[PDB]
DNA sequence: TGTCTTCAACTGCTTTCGCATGAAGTACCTCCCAACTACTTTTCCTCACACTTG
């Protein structure tokens, strides 16, 4: 029922400029910042492209 | 009147990030509590003596 309401029209002039938000799960198109303690250097905390692996 | 020098006392830090799993102080005091035994408590039960009789 909510899937057919994600695109509803404006309702209040207070909110007419916004659009709804969806808290989507992390997926294969997001980048994530991996850090390993040692931080000793900036190269020890890089951004990797997320690949969800099954049964991990 | 003025400026200088050493020593000892005082200040602040000296790996990061998480699991465990939190527990334990205690003197002085006690009033409450649990105890053993005896004592006490409430209802009930049943008999008994004297004067008089003949």
UniProtKB/Swiss-Prot annotation:
It is found in: Nucleus, Nucleolus. The lineage of its organism: Eukaryota, Fungi, Dikarya, Ascomycota, Saccharomycotina. The chain holds residues 556 to 611 of 1664 of the full protein. Belongs to the RNA polymerase beta' chain family. This is DNA-directed RNA polymerase I subunit RPA190. Component of the RNA polymerase I (Pol I) complex consisting of 14 subunits: RPA135, RPA190, RPC40, RPA14, RPB5, RPO26, RPA43, RPB8, RPA12, RPB10, RPC19, RPC10, RPA49 and RPA34. The complex is composed of a horseshoe-shaped core containing ten subunits (RPA135, RPA190, RPB5, RPO26, RPB8, RPB10, RPC10, RPA12, RPC19 and RPC40) where RPA135 and RPA190 form the DNA-binding cleft. Outside of the core, RPA14 and RPA43 form the stalk that mediates interactions with transcription initiation factors and newly synthesized RNA. Present with 2840 molecules/cell in log phase SD medium. DNA-dependent RNA polymerases catalyze the transcription of DNA into RNA using the four ribonucleoside triphosphates as substrates. Component of RNA polymerase I (Pol I) which synthesizes ribosomal RNA precursors. Besides, RNA polymerase I has intrinsic RNA cleavage activity. RPA190 and RPA135 both contribute to the polymerase catalytic activity and together form the Pol I active center. In addition, subunit RPA12 contributes a catalytic zinc ribbon that is required for RNA cleavage by Pol I.
